[PDB]
Amino acid sequence: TMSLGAENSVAYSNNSIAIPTNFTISVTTEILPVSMTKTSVDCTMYICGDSTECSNLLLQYGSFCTQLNRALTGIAVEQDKNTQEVFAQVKQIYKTPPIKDFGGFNFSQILPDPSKPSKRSFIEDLLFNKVTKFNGLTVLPPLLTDEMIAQYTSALLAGTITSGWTFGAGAALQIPFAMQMAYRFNGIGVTQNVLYENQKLIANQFNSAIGKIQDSLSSTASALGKLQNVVNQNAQALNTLVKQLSSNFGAISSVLNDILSRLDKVEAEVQIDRLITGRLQSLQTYVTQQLIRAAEIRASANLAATKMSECVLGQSKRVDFCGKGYHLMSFPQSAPHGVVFLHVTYVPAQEKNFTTAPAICHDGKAHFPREGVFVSNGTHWFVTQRNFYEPQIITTDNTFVSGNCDVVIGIVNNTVYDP
Amino acid sequence: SALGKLQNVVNQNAQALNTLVKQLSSNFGAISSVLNDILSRLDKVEAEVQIDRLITGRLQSLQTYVTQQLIRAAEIRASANLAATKMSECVLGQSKRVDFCGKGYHLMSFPQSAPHGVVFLHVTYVPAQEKNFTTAPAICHDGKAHFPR
Amino acid sequence: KCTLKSFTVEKGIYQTSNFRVQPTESIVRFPNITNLCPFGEVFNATRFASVYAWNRKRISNCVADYSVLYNSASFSTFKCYGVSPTKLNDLCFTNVYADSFVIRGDEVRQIAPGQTGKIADYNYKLPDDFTGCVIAWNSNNLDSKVGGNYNYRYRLFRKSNLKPFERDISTEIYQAGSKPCNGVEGFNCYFPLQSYGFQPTNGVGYQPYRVVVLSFELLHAPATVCGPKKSTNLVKNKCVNFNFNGLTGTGVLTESNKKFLPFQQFGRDIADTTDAVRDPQTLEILDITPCSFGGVSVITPGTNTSNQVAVLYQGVNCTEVPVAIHADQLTPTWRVYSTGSNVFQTRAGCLIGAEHVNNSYECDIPIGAGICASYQTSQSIIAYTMSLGAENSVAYSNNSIAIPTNFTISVTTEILPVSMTKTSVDCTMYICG
Amino acid sequence: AYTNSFTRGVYYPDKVFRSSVLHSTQDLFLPFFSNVTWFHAIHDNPVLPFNDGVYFASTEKSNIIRGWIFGTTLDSKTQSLLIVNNATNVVIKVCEFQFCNDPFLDVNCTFEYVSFKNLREFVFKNIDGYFKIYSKHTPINLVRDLPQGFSALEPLVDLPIGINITRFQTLLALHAAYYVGYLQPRTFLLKYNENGTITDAVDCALDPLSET
Ligand SMILES: *[C@@H]1O[C@H](CO)[C@@H](O[C@@H]2O[C@H](CO)[C@@H](O)[C@H](O)[C@H]2NC(C)=O)[C@H](O)[C@H]1NC(C)=O
Ligand SMILES: *[C@@H]1O[C@H](CO)[C@@H](O[C@@H]2O[C@H](CO)[C@@H](O)[C@H](O)[C@H]2NC(C)=O)[C@H](O)[C@H]1NC(C)=O
Ligand SMILES: *[C@@H]1O[C@H](CO)[C@@H](O[C@@H]2O[C@H](CO)[C@@H](O)[C@H](O)[C@H]2NC(C)=O)[C@H](O)[C@H]1NC(C)=O
Ligand SMILES: *[C@@H]1O[C@H](CO)[C@@H](O[C@@H]2O[C@H](CO)[C@@H](O)[C@H](O)[C@H]2NC(C)=O)[C@H](O)[C@H]1NC(C)=O
Ligand SMILES: *[C@@H]1O[C@H](CO)[C@@H](O[C@@H]2O[C@H](CO)[C@@H](O)[C@H](O)[C@H]2NC(C)=O)[C@H](O)[C@H]1NC(C)=O
Ligand SMILES: *[C@@H]1O[C@H](CO)[C@@H](O)[C@H](O)[C@H]1NC(C)=O
Ligand SMILES: *[C@@H]1O[C@H](CO)[C@@H](O)[C@H](O)[C@H]1NC(C)=O
Ligand SMILES: *[C@@H]1O[C@H](CO)[C@@H](O)[C@H](O)[C@H]1NC(C)=O
Ligand SMILES: *[C@@H]1O[C@H](CO)[C@@H](O)[C@H](O)[C@H]1NC(C)=O
Ligand SMILES: *[C@@H]1O[C@H](CO)[C@@H](O)[C@H](O)[C@H]1NC(C)=O
Ligand SMILES: *[C@@H]1O[C@H](CO)[C@@H](O)[C@H](O)[C@H]1NC(C)=O
Ligand SMILES: *[C@@H]1O[C@H](CO)[C@@H](O)[C@H](O)[C@H]1NC(C)=O
Numbered sequence A: 001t002m003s004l005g006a007e008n009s010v011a012y013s014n015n016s017i018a019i020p021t022n023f024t025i026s027v028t029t030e031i032l033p034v035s036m037t038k039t040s041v042d043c044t045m046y047i048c049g050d051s052t053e054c055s056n057l058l059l060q061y062g063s064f065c066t067q068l069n070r071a072l073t074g075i076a077v078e079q080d081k082n083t084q085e086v087f088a089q090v091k092q093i094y095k096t097p098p099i100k101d102f103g104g105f106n107f108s109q110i111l112p113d114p115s116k117p118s119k120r121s122f123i124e125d126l127l128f129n130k131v132t133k134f135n136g137l138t139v140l141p142p143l144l145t146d147e148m149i150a151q152y153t154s155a156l157l158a159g160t161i162t163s164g165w166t167f168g169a170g171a172a173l174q175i176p177f178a179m180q181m182a183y184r185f186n187g188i189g190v191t192q193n194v195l196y197e198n199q200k201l202i203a204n205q206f207n208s209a210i211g212k213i214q215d216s217l218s219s220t221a222s223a224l225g226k227l228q229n230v231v232n233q234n235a236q237a238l239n240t241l242v243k244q245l246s247s248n249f250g251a252i253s254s255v256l257n258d259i260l261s262r263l264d265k266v267e268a269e270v271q272i273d274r275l276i277t278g279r280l281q282s283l284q285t286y287v288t289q290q291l292i293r294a295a296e297i298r299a300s301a302n303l304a305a306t307k308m309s310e311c312v313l314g315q316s317k318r319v320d321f322c323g324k325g326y327h328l329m330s331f332p333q334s335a336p337h338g339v340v341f342l343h344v345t346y347v348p349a350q351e352k353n354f355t356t357a358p359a360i361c362h363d364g365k366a367h368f369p370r371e372g373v374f375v376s377n378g379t380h381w382f383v384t385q386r387n388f389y390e391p392q393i394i395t396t397d398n399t400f401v402s403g404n405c406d407v408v409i410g411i412v413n414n415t416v417y418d419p
Numbered sequence B: 001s002a003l004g005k006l007q008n009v010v011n012q013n014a015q016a017l018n019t020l021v022k023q024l025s026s027n028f029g030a031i032s033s034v035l036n037d038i039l040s041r042l043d044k045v046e047a048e049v050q051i052d053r054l055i056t057g058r059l060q061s062l063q064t065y066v067t068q069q070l071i072r073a074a075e076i077r078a079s080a081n082l083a084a085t086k087m088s089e090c091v092l093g094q095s096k097r098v099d100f101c102g103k104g105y106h107l108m109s110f111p112q113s114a115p116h117g118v119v120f121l122h123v124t125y126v127p128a129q130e131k132n133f134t135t136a137p138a139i140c141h142d143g144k145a146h147f148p149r
Numbered sequence C: 001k002c003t004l005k006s007f008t009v010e011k012g013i014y015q016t017s018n019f020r021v022q023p024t025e026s027i028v029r030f031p032n033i034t035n036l037c038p039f040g041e042v043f044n045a046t047r048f049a050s051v052y053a054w055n056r057k058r059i060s061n062c063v064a065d066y067s068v069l070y071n072s073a074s075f076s077t078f079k080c081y082g083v084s085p086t087k088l089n090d091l092c093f094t095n096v097y098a099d100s101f102v103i104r105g106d107e108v109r110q111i112a113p114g115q116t117g118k119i120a121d122y123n124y125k126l127p128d129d130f131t132g133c134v135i136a137w138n139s140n141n142l143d144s145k146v147g148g149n150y151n152y153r154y155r156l157f158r159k160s161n162l163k164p165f166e167r168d169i170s171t172e173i174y175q176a177g178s179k180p181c182n183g184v185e186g187f188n189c190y191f192p193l194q195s196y197g198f199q200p201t202n203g204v205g206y207q208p209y210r211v212v213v214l215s216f217e218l219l220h221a222p223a224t225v226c227g228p229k230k231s232t233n234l235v236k237n238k239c240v241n242f243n244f245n246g247l248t249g250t251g252v253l254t255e256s257n258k259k260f261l262p263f264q265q266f267g268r269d270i271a272d273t274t275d276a277v278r279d280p281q282t283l284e285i286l287d288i289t290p291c292s293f294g295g296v297s298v299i300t301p302g303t304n305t306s307n308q309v310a311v312l313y314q315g316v317n318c319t320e321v322p323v324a325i326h327a328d329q330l331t332p333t334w335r336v337y338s339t340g341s342n343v344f345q346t347r348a349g350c351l352i353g354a355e356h357v358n359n360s361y362e363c364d365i366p367i368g369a370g371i372c373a374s375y376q377t378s379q380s381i382i383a384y385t386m387s388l389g390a391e392n393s394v395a396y397s398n399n400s401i402a403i404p405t406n407f408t409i410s411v412t413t414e415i416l417p418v419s420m421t422k423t424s425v426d427c428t429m430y431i432c433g
Numbered sequence D: 001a002y003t004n005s006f007t008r009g010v011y012y013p014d015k016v017f018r019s020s021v022l023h024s025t026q027d028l029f030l031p032f033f034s035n036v037t038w039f040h041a042i043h044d045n046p047v048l049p050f051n052d053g054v055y056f057a058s059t060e061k062s063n064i065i066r067g068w069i070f071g072t073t074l075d076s077k078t079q080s081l082l083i084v085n086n087a088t089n090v091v092i093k094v095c096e097f098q099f100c101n102d103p104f105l106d107v108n109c110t111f112e113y114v115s116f117k118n119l120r121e122f123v124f125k126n127i128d129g130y131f132k133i134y135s136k137h138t139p140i141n142l143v144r145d146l147p148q149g150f151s152a153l154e155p156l157v158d159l160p161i162g163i164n165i166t167r168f169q170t171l172l173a174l175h176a177a178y179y180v181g182y183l184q185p186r187t188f189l190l191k192y193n194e195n196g197t198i199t200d201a202v203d204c205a206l207d208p209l210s211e212t
C-alpha cells in the first residue's frame, strides 16, 4: 500500500508561534515542452506514390487530400509561433557584461561558453546531451536554429543579471547585483539588511545549489522525461503511419504495383479503392492525433511564455508558480523541443518556538505592531519581521495605537518605550 | 490588417463551410455525384450499391467537419477563458503580473467590443530619460549602517 | 496558382502540388530463357486422367506464350483468379503447375475456389485463395464411349475433404453403415470408384468435358517460367518506367552497394516495398527511388506586386537539382530554375531564383534555419540570414545605477477572439436531401 | 537422453534483404528453451518421427553423419527422401526401394538431384508438399550439449516432391554426437543488422517478458 507521506501534529495553541531563526536558498529546476517536430506530408505521394492510375481514382474523393495537407501546414507553422512567443520576449540582444563582479554569485555555468562551437552555456550543453520520414512524409527544420535560441537565452540572462525587472518594462537600467537581490529580498517581505549582513553566505548557498544541478543532470537522462516524451511520441506516430503502408485493408496486396501488374483496370479499381480508403483513413487518423497533440504542446508553450514574462522578466507573488518557497529570481536555459528554468527561491530553515499575543497594553491604550509580530522569549517582549527572527525593542514608532485594553481577546501588558 | 485574429476567425468558418459544400460534388466511386442520376438510371438492387458509396463518402466528410469544429471550438474557448481573465484582472483591477496587461507597468484597461471578439486598450506607465548616478547599498553615520526606507 | 485553385497568390511560401509533365520512358529486364513451354501437349494429348486421380506437371525454365490459348477461344471456359488473363504474356513466375483430367460438363462447376460437391469434397480441392486459371472444353466426341466410360471416377463416399492440392489414390471399402464392415462389403459397406456412363449421344450436360488447371507460383525466389517479353537496354540515373520479371515500377534505376546474401533476390523498405533488385541478365544489384523526389516550395511576393518567383527544393543539394526535376523533360520557363547564378544552399535545401545578401534584416518570408526572403531593389527576391534585433550592452558596474527622470503613458491595444459562428447541419438533408 | 536447445534454431524466413530493422514474422521455428534428444555413434540411429519439421544438428570433425532417410514408412513400398553426402557430392533421391539397405556408408523414383571441431545445424520442413532445407556450419570447441549462443541458418534447397513424410532416420559411416528436436508455429521478433544479416531474436510466447 503506497504511503501518502509522514504524519505530523502541528504544535498549535491559542498563544504559540514558531519563527525561523535562519534561511536557505534553493535552485529548483522546471522543464516544459515548447515545440514538437515540424512534419509535413505530400498526401498523394503517400496514398498512391508515383502512379497515374491510382491518382485519377484519388481525385474522385475531392478535397480530402488538400484539407489534410492544410491542417498539417497549420501545425507546422505554429511550432515557430510557440518558439517565438517563449524566447523572443526581449527586443534586443543584450551581450554578456565584461567583468563578472556580481557580489560573489558565479553565473559561469549558465552564461554562454565561448569555447563551445554553438555558444550554449555549460548547463545548456548537458541538456542537449540528455535528450536523444521517407514515403511522401517529410520533416522541416525550425525557423530559429539552436544557436539563435542560445543567443536569446543569453540575452534574457544578461539583461536579468545586469538590470533586473527593468528590461521588461522599458530600456534596461544598470544596477549592482547585490542591490538587485536586496530589492528581491524586500519583495518576499524580508528586510533588506538581512541580505547585506549575510551576502557571502547567501552567494555560497547559490553557488553550491548551481553545483548540485550539474551533478543532478549528469546522474540520469530520466531527469528530461518530459522532453524525451515529445521526441518519442512523434517518432512512434511516424513509424505507425509508415508501417500502415504494409497493411492490406482487405485488398489482395498491400503493394500497389502487384495489383497494377496482375489486374486489368476494371478489376484493379475494386482492389485499389480499398487501399485508397484504408490509407486515407490511416492518414486522417495520424493528422487527427497530431492536431490534438499540437493543442497540448501549445498549452505548454503558453505556460512557458507566462513563466518567462512573470518570473524571468520580474518577480512572482503567485504561490508555487515559480519554484517552492518564496520566489526570488529565475534563469532560463534552452533544451531540445523545450525550455528549462532554474528557479531561485528562499526557504525558512531553523524554526524556534515563542510565546505571542495579538496586541499590547500600555497606558490603557492597546498597541499593535506596525510591521511584523509581537513575541516573547519568556522574560521579555519584542517585535520581529514575520519571516526571519530579528527581535527589536517595542517602541512608539514600531507600533501603532487603537482603542483601549478591554476589546482585544488575548492582549498582554508590556511597557512601550518612547525614543 | 491590424485585426488579423478576428478576420481569420471569420475566414476559417467560411472556408470550412465552402469545403463542406464542395464535397457534395465528389463521386467517391459512384457513377455520378448527383443522387437523382443514380435513382433515374438504375433499378433499386443496383442503385443501392452506388447510393451507399455516396452515403459513405458524404458521412465521412461531415464527421471530418464536426471533428475539426470540435478541435477549433476548444481553441476559441482557450482564448475566451484568457479574455475572461483579462476582463477580471486588468479592467476590474490593476495587475502586478509582468506583461499580462500590456508592456510597461500596468495602470488601467478599457474593453471595446468587436465582431467575434474583444479588444482591450491597456494603459501602461513606461519609464524614460535615464541618468547615471553613483550608488551604494548602505550609509555610515555615527558608525551605524543606515539603510533606505 | 493551381495548388491554391486561385488566380491571385498572396506574399509568402507555398508547398506546390506536382503538375509537371515528366513524360518518362520504359525499361524491361528478363532472364535469357528460350525453351518453349509444352502447352501443345498439356492441352492436346489423346486422353487426360480420371478426375479421382488427376494428372499433374511442374513446369519450369521456359517461354510461356499464352497467346495461342488466348486466340483459341474455342475453349468453353478460360477463367482466372487473382490475375487478368491479358497479363500472362507480361507477368512471370518462379514455377507453374498444370493439373488435368476429364469430368461431366455440368460438374466442372466444382473446379473453383469456394465450391462444394463430391469431387470438390473428396478428390480435387483448390485453396479458396487460389491464384491461377481453369480452362475447360467439351470433349464428348473423344471421351464418350459405350454409354459406359466408367474410367472417369469420383468417390462414392468416405469422410473429410481432400485438402488444397493434396493427392489421394487409396483403394478401400468405405464403411457407410453402423455395421463393423471391417473388410466385408454389403448394403452400407462398399468400395467407392463410381463413374460416368458417357454415351456419345448424351445430352449436353451429361457429356464429358476436358479440364486443365494452371497454378502460378509468384514467390520472391528466381523466376523461371516467363512470357514472350523482350528485355531493353538498361538505362541508369533517369526517371523510367521499369519491369523486372513482371515486378513493375516507375522511378530512377541506379547502381547500388546493398550487401545482399547470395539467395536474397530483393531489398525492402520499412513500408515492406521493394527498393533494390538483382538484374536477371546482368546480376548487378540496382537501387530504386521514385522519379527523383524532393519537396518543391515556392517563395513569392504577392502576384498583386510582382510575378517574379523563387523556388526552394526542400531536402536536396544544389549540385543535384536539375536531376531532381529532370530538366531533360520539362518546360523551358520551368527549366530556368536549375543553375542560373542566383542559386544558393540553405540548410533546408537548395534555393534558386533568389539573390543572396550578406546583411541581416527582420524576417519577411520565412525559409528555414535562420534564412528569410523579401522583395527589394530594379526589384528582385533577396534572401538573407535574419536579424535577432539590435545588439546592446548594459553599462554594468558594482557602484553605478541608472534612474529614469521622466515617463510616457502608453496605450497598448490587445485583440482576442471570444466566439465563433454558431451552426447546425441537418444530416439527412445534407447526405440525402 | 534429453538436453535443451536454449537459443538455437533460427533461420532466414524469406528471400529478402532487410537492414537495421526489428522485423517480426510467424513461422515453424524451434521454440526457445525447447528440449531435444542427444545421440552418439553406437548400435543410436533407429527410425524417429518427423512431426511438423525437424531441427537436427551434429558435432564432428570428420563427417561421421553422412545422410538421412525420410518418408511415411521407409519400406520399399512408397517414396522416401534419401539424402547422402558421398564426399565428392551431396546426393538426393525419392525412391521407395532399399537398393542399398545399410544405415551407413561402408568404411519410380520421380525426383533425383546432385550438388567436435565443427557443428553442423540442419532444419528440415515441408509446406504444401514443398520440402525446404536450411543449414549452418560453424567451428566450435564444446561440451556434450548445444552451444548457448546465436547464428541463423540460410536456406540450401526447396524441393516440390509432395511426399506425406511422417518418419525419418540418419545415415552414418561404419564397417561423434548429434541432436534432434521439433518445429512449432511461433511468432518471432528478428534483428536484421546494417549488413542484411539476422543477429538476434525473441520468441514472443516464451514468457511475460517476451510478450512485453
Ligand atoms: C544559518 O544556516 C547556515 C547553513 O544553512 C549556517 O552556515 C554554516 O555555518 C557553519 C559554521 O557554524 C559552517 O561550517 C558552514 O560551512 C556554513 N554553511 C555554509 C553553506 O556556508 C549558519 O551558521 C547558520 N546561522 C545561524 C545563526 O545559525
Ligand atoms: C566560478 O565557478 C567555476 C565552476 O562553475 C569555477 O571554475 C573552475 O574552478 C576550478 C578551481 O576551483 C578549476 O579547477 C576549473 O578548471 C574551473 N573551470 C572552469 C571552466 O573555469 C570558477 O573558478 C569560479 N570563478 C569565480 C570567479 O568564482
Ligand atoms: C530574553 O531577551 C533578553 C534581552 O536579550 C535577555 O536579557 C538579557 O540577557 C543577557 C544575558 O543573556 C544579559 O547580559 C542582559 O543584561 C539582559 N538584558 C535585559 C534587558 O534583561 C533575556 O535573558 C532573555 N530571556 C531568556 C529566558 O532567554
Ligand atoms: C494589565 O494591567 C492592568 C492595570 O494597568 C490590570 O488591570 C487591573 O486588573 C485587576 C485584576 O483583574 C482589576 O481588579 C483592576 O480593576 C484592573 N485595573 C484597571 C485599571 O483596569 C490587568 O489585570 C493587567 N493584565 C494582566 C494580564 O496582567
Ligand atoms: C497422408 O496420409 C493420410 C493417411 O495416413 C491420408 O489420409 C486420408 O486423407 C483423405 C483426403 O485426401 C481423407 O478423406 C481420408 O479420411 C484420410 N484417411 C483416413 C484413414 O482418414 C492423407 O491423404 C495423406 N495426406 C497427404 C497430404 O498426402
Ligand atoms: C515547541 O514547544 C513544544 C513544547 O511542548 C514542543 O512540543 C514542540 O515540538 C516545539 N516546536 C519547535 C518547532 O521547537
Ligand atoms: C488559551 O488556552 C488556555 C487553556 O489552555 C486558556 O486558559 C486561555 O484562556 C486561552 N487564551 C486565549 C487567548 O484563548
Ligand atoms: C553611464 O556611464 C558610462 C560610463 O562609462 C557610460 O558609458 C554610459 O554610456 C552612461 N549611460 C547613460 C545612459 O548615461
Ligand atoms: C543474355 O543474352 C544476351 C543477348 O540477348 C547476351 O549478350 C548475354 O551475354 C546473355 N547473358 C547471360 C548471363 O546469359
Ligand atoms: C493441337 O494439335 C493440332 C495438330 O494435331 C494443332 O493443329 C492444334 O493447333 C493444337 N492445339 C493446341 C492448343 O496446341
Ligand atoms: C493590389 O492591386 C490593387 C489593384 O488591383 C491596388 O489597388 C493595390 O494598391 C495593390 N496592393 C498591393 C499591396 O500591391
Ligand atoms: C553537395 O553535393 C556534392 C555532391 O554532388 C558534395 O560534394 C557536397 O559536399 C555537398 N555539400 C553539402 C553542403 O552537402
Ligand SMILES: *[C@@H]1O[C@H](CO)[C@@H](O)[C@H](O)[C@H]1NC(C)=O
Pocket (backbone or CB within 6 Å): C357, C358
Ligand atoms: C559576402 O561575404 C563573403 C565573406 O564572408 C564574401 O566572400 C562575399 O563576396 C560577400 N558578398 C557580398 C555581396 O558582399
Ligand SMILES: *[C@@H]1O[C@H](CO)[C@@H](O)[C@H](O)[C@H]1NC(C)=O
Pocket (backbone or CB within 6 Å): D002, D033, D035
Ligand atoms: C526436459 O526433459 C526433462 C526430462 O528429461 C523434463 O523433466 C523437463 O521438464 C523438460 N523441460 C521442460 C522445459 O519442460
Ligand SMILES: *[C@@H]1O[C@H](CO)[C@@H](O)[C@H](O)[C@H]1NC(C)=O
Pocket (backbone or CB within 6 Å): D077, D078, D079, D108
Ligand atoms: C510407384 O509409387 C507408388 C506410390 O507412390 C506405388 O503405388 C506404385 O505401385 C509404384 N510403381 C512402381 C512401378 O514401382
Ligand SMILES: *[C@@H]1O[C@H](CO)[C@@H](O)[C@H](O)[C@H]1NC(C)=O
Pocket (backbone or CB within 6 Å): D086, D087, D088, D089, D091, D114
Ligand atoms: C557420389 O554420387 C555421384 C552421383 O550421385 C557420383 O557421380 C559420384 O561418383 C559419387 N562418388 C562416390 C565417392 O561414390
Ligand SMILES: *[C@@H]1O[C@H](CO)[C@@H](O)[C@H](O)[C@H]1NC(C)=O
Pocket (backbone or CB within 6 Å): D193, D194, D195
Ligand atoms: C558490415 O560489413 C563491412 C564489410 O563489408 C564491415 O566493415 C562492417 O563492420 C560490418 N558491420 C556489421 C554490423 O557487421
